[PDB]
Write a protein that binds this ligand. Structure first.
Ligand code: FAD
Ligand code: FAD
Ligand code: FAD
Ligand code: AMP
Ligand code: AMP
Lengths: 461, 460, 460, 461
């Protein structure tokens, strides 16, 4: 009874089906295998590698306390590494968990086949979803509303597993520092992110409990204001699998049941909104499984990414992104739509910059969001219409705090004109300290002309 | 697909296996059946019926919100009621959960047999234990005999149970009555019973809220507070566990996860606290296990009355009885102390003590009660033998080092020095005059001398 | 420039006029002189001597830090001690503060005369009042006779006093002894007296800390909490004011400033609270004023003993005496209730009640004591006349609406309904059985019937 | 018994000697007289007029509640206004308080003389000092240490007065809006300062009590760090006389006595430091009573005042000044010294800009501070030596928080190089996002060349 447990993106010990199976079966030999060449162009970015290294150290200590140890292998081939581990330890079984990336599907199939050839049994489980994409049908659905209605109607077919108690212990293995996860010049700069975040599954649990117990009830109200911290902040923890989506779902549903019993309408609204947000991730993976004339201007892109456009919401969004590796949903919508519909940029550049900076860069969610904003989905905002900054501000930033915190040189403009300065008269722009051109930039491209150019490209249709 | 779900002592909706099975299968018809005559002499007491009524109302509202409704039947026969429900609704299946009381075992077997006669399928699950009593044995296939070896084996093994999410919705579907005609409460004792709401608040929605707070903020100090009887030091989960409003597997998982983190980061106090709590949890398993596997007093009435009202003369006994009658609870050391006093000092028939505890304790549970009384009475080699009586001064110095527990429940002794507060018959009359205390006039002289009772027990 | 500062009842350093004068003048020699024989029958009681000793130690450390030192003399004559200090240090002046006790007036006059004979100058100031008793009179030059008119006039007038900062440093300069040979405390009663530190903590540094917190966070609710006897509702400043560790002018200014702000911003509740507090403050002035301007019992011993131990049968009386003996304090309504009970029910000689209050109360003050006893006894037209006795049910409904005060100090009555908790001899035996209460066996039947005592008082 | 109470800079009712005297004497007629022409060039600035208007409204409500009313007169002559009030109400006496400004001294003397001519008695008191400047002598002292030692040795000769209880009531009077305190274009911009401050004597008391009860004990430690809020923030309240300096002094001294009794060395240090700070104001008024080759470059001055010099501490100081009307003592030292010793500016411009922006512009304290930094006092730092930014930062801003809060575009520079960026190599300036010239300015003048030019002007001596 010797089993090899393969770790890829499930860096936790609670509700881990493959680990629970192997540990109940017999003796275990955990392993992590890192192979840059197989990833292709889905190679993770800097903000992701930093979080991955911290989580790997946390997990290694956790395993060593229990009684076994993590082993790290950097290689050029995965089959070779698995076969070498087999030849050295004399195992019988191999177990792992499912992923739905294209590369992941191909690699899993190849491993399964080339291992069953030599008379060694393999097994895979499901650890990252509520319903598998091949389990919900009408034909596949085509709209989120019908999809989510069906999913709510059905009943879940999964149980939760307790963590293993102890592990019975049992080549070119290396150490966490020779994996080459971080460059040499960028260690002191990357170290600053510890000011806001702290990776590890022991910290994911501590965050979720506090959110559920004290902040859910106000979600329906705070979930439209971009200042402070209003949402839950669980995306980087969910991307690496340090928390269980089934766990989150159960906690939210139990709160909703109590609130609905005692007639708390605000509670019901908040819980429903949160669960709809949770279900959008399922829908993203589902659609990815079931359905597999720009201006090449460089300085425009550079100004976009540094925050010198002239529009306050865009400027503050980019300013917070580069400094904390995060930004609100409305700001994601706003900045992405600006980048495509205003400066007419190739959307690949925007996707790639988000890939390298965002602390939670996830392929399916990224693609779904960009399709939504770009108007390739009938459910959304069509490419034709551009929104008005004054209305955006009045709706989401009613008092100017978000502006005045990240752009201090605009701390004494009245709340009436703080979002569209090119409107306010020179008398007010003198009474205030603001001075366009000298200590704040005049708008990089006029709104009307860009609207006309997009009208060309649209009325062509 | 029509199923009848039977509710007896599992008044919750999370981690309820029978309910989860029926709801996933099809349409459900929940029912609660109350039958005084079958209980015998294990009929529940007043403090238990009060809690049961409040929990039943809470559960009924909870079910009605989901989309079905609880139905309450008071009868003289259980088979008749089940058959009537069958005849009226046209079901196919019956499901329930396991209990390990003698009456429960007999009734479950009879129901299973007399129902399988008529071609209706039945099913029972396990909802109240970690390991079933028939699953743990020694190398020669023999049951264990000592708690230490038993718990070592249980720790070594691995658990064979999963947890189930609550059902989402229920598809709805005789002499049914209402929560007020069950006759759970007398007529004169409603205003007096109402006062207990000052301290407790029943319901599974409240059990969850209590457990989360205990685990998050008080576990780490359990190893220290768990020997002081004043304030609130322990967890206070026994009445919630007796009625099954919380899941023992849930409690076990939470404690174990905390222990893993503390052991990783080298927190010795954390490890000690977690181990103590889990040993406490395992003692309940052991109690049910032993119950499953192994099925010259002075008839003085006024002595018993003085015992139960709190006029013995010994401060710890007096404060224990005083808090018991007023809040329906008392600490483990106080349970040990009062029980041992009642048997070894006044030589009372132990049945009376068992029965008074049965009627007053808010969490009267048969197995735990029997296990505790055996331990204190010395019928178990692991314990304190009947021969030795303990010294009040040492008891006090060990558990009540500053006299707070005494001075709160016995205020007329609020200016006796901490040195003599536990054995007043020692302090000289000069100190008993400087203090306000006056034995015989506003506090009782000891009801029986310690030495003479020790001699009589030495005879026996 | 050598001055002798005399300390009697002004144990503070802020707003001390005599000390400020001497320190600004030159070199100082502080002194405290204790003389039991001159006091007579106004000798302070045990709870007062305890507080006095703690405050004296605090003050001595405070002075030694500044740069001089307190000197303590126990003697048989005061003139002899002052003359000896003069002969040893070669001073020029003597300064002190005013008191309005009879003994104080006589002693101050004698000292002034016998010192001015020998060519040494003396001086006295005013440190304990707002207006001196000889400064307020009516249009015909007559003293007032009712509190309402008196306080209206006092409010109308304007204050004629300033506040003085504490001295910065002191330039230093017989049978002197130590704080332990003054004989302030007996030998057997040190361990028992030590327990009061559980609730109180003497010293002027603590009086300031208490006043600031009260004013900043509790004044605004005074008008509401000031009629409920449970918990802590009032300010608790009386023992600090009796020893002069805080300045009544300071208290007055703080309250008035809060009232001005609240009245500006239209806060009716704030205005009511502030007015009530200041009326309370002014009652002390009135007490000293009247004392300055106007200089057939049953001799039953066991009745008195039962009264003082708390075995009468009436819950409010029992809880009041129970809290008095244990903390040295009680609420104003409880003072009214217990005093009126003692005179109008058991027909006791009022001297005994006055003396027991004198020995137990932590703030025994002559003028306030006399004023309160006159009010309750009906020798003042403003009050409640001796004829009428109040009803316990109405008293309870008015002041203790939920029974908490009863159930905390009398735990053996913790499960009587809130309807009958104040007059148990009314509730039927069915309720007295459903509850645990049992009159005669664990709680006393009323010591004297209310109706018969009312008839006897109706005779008188 | 009719008295006229004159209000100039004592906008409180507690410990007001003139008001207490008049109210105890008889019937009162309070008055405030505003006369722009007599002020000269000591005319108050915008941030001062805003605070003055709010405090005047607060005081007017306070008086009207008591039972009299404030009367506001804007005029061209003060003698004319006083004589008109006399002719209309038929008074007997006039009372006011002392000020030590040059204009104040002249005006008070003229009023006293021209009023005593007509047989009307006048009276003045002392309301703003501990010791009058003519009361301490050795000859006058010449150094702060000896002065303060003598002042500590002596004993105070002042008592405190309770507020009056009620007032017995009794021309071109106008309203708070026709005084013309605020311009028309700058009302919406000025309104923003309410975000941080709240004027009024009822608020000054509430602030002082909280400071004394909870923050004094840490003064000796927090009093060297420029980030957050460490000091007491009482200067604007003390400038307008809404709190009593004698009150502050008594509270601090009482705390010190208790701490010294119970052997708390840190407590003693904190209390002594605070009282030395208090005494520096006395010394400033004392010296003012007893002892009555720049580059004319405009764009350099503009860059200084907008915050585009290149030096992080200067930039953050000016950025916080324009937005909240305040700055720490070390920042005042740093910015003033920079302005004189680096860009060689005429010091009058710096004095005037501070005059218009600072919320607490006070003549004596301003002059004393500028003399100290400029080296005209032997007790100080001589003009010759310029300080090193790295050492300044290590001493006062050990972690870079003050920099990263007011200059967010520098939020990922390591704490080692955050104060002197022109030192860090281009590898680190690439790993960080910072880019000199494009989104942050290269130093406006080199440190070495300015040091050489100042060495010319100094070695001339
Ligand atoms: C252009 C664009 C790009 C995006 N890129 C990403 C990305 O790389 N990674 C990513 O995880 N999300 C992405 N999103 C989705 C969304 O912006 C974030 O998931 C959201 O900010 C999560 O933050 P939160 O947990 O604090 O918010 P919460 O409101 O607390 O969200 C709770 C959880 O619900 C899920 N969720 C909520 N809304 C969405 C949504 N619209 N789409 C998918 N899942 C959702 C997430 O898992 C999230 O953790 C993108 C959206 C847009 C418009
Ligand atoms: C004479 C006597 C009578 C008892 N009668 C009862 C009874 O009727 N009902 C009852 O539930 N317990 C009984 N006990 C056990 C024990 O006194 C209580 O279980 C304990 O007070 C539970 O309170 P707690 O949850 O606050 O303490 P905790 O220390 O928090 O206990 C945690 C849990 O562990 C279990 N547990 C801990 N110690 C024991 C133990 N010695 N035996 C069994 N289970 C234990 C209980 O389920 C308890 O809820 C009795 C003990 C004695 C000596
Ligand atoms: C029978 C009887 C005896 C009393 N004996 C004393 C005594 O020995 N010493 C004593 O100080 N008070 C005495 N009082 C007055 C009153 O009971 C207490 O002053 C009051 O409890 C003070 O407590 P407090 O400061 O918490 O209440 P608060 O309401 O906060 O009182 C504030 C202050 O006002 C003064 N005050 C308020 N009410 C009265 C009053 N009726 N008479 C005089 N002063 C008042 C006290 O100085 C008190 O400190 C007696 C009253 C009665 C009826
Ligand atoms: N059909 C969809 N596809 C992708 N994203 C969506 C979709 N619907 C809503 N969202 C996201 O969820 C947010 C909800 O906004 P609203 O539709 O106003 O409730 C949107 O702003 C998007 O960020
Ligand atoms: N073998 C046992 N049987 C029954 N109860 C026990 C047993 N061991 C311990 N207990 C209970 O657990 C407590 C633990 O006490 P100690 O043995 O001192 O740790 C005892 O005081 C009993 O209440």
């Amino acid at each position: 009874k010797k089993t090899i447990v393969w770790f890829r993106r499930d860096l936790r010990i609670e509700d881990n089906p493959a680990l629970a199976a192997a540990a109940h079966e017999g003796s275990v030999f955990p392993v992590f295998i890192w192979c840059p060449e197989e990833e292709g162009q889905f190679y993770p970015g800097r903000a992701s590698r930093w979080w991955m290294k911290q989580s790997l150290a946390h997990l290694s200590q956790s395993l060593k306390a229990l009684g076994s140890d993590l082993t790290l292998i950097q290689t050029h081939n995965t089959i070779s590494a698995i076969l070498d581990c087999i030849r050295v330890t004399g195992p019988t079984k191999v177990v792992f968990n499912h992923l739905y990336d294209p590369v992941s599907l191909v690699r899993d199939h190849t491993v399964k086949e080339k291992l069953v050839e030599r008379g060694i049994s393999v097994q895979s489980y499901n650890g990252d979803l509520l319903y598998e994409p091949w389990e919900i049908y009408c034909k596949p659905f085509t709209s989120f509303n019908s999809y989510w209605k069906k999913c709510l109607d059905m009943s879940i077919e999964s149980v939760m597993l307790p963590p293993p108690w102890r592990l019975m212990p049992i080549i070119w293995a290396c150490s966490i520092e020779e994996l080459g996860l971080e460059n040499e010049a960028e260690k002191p700069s990357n170290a600053l992110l510890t000011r806001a975040w702290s990776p590890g599954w022991s910290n994911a649990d501590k965050l979720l409990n506090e959110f559920i117990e004290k902040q859910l009830i106000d979600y329906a109200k705070n979930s439209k204001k971009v200042v402070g911290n209003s949402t839950s902040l669980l995306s980087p923890y969910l991307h690496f699998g340090e928390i269980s989506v089934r766990h989150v779902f159960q906690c939210a549903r139990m709160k909703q049941i109590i609130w609905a019993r005692d007639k708390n309408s605000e509670g019901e609204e908040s819980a429903d909104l949160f669960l709809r947000g949770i279900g959008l991730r399922e829908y993203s993976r589902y659609i990815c499984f079931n359905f597999p004339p720009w201006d090449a201007d460089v300085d425009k892109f550079k100004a976009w990414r540094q925050g010198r456009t002239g529009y306050p919401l865009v400027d503050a969004g980019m300013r917070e992104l580069w400094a904390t590796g995060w930004m609100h949903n409305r700001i994601r919508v706003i900045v992405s739509s600006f980048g495509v519909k205003f400066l007419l940029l190739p959307w690949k550049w925007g996707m790639k910059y988000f890939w390298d900076t965002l602390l939670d860069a996830d392929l399916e969610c990224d693609i779904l969001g960009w399709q939504y904003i770009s108007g390739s989905i009938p459910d959304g905002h069509e490419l034709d219409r551009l929104d008005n900054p004054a209305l955006q501000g009045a709706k989401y930033d009613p008092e100017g705090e978000y502006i005045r915190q990240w752009l201090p040189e605009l701390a004494r403009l009245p709340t009436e004109w703080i979002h569209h300065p090119w409107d306010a008269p020179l008398t007010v722009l003198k009474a205030s300290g603001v001075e366009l051109g000298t200590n704040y930039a005049k708008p990089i491209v006029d709104i009307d002309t860009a609207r006309e150019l997009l009208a060309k490209a649209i009325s062509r249709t």
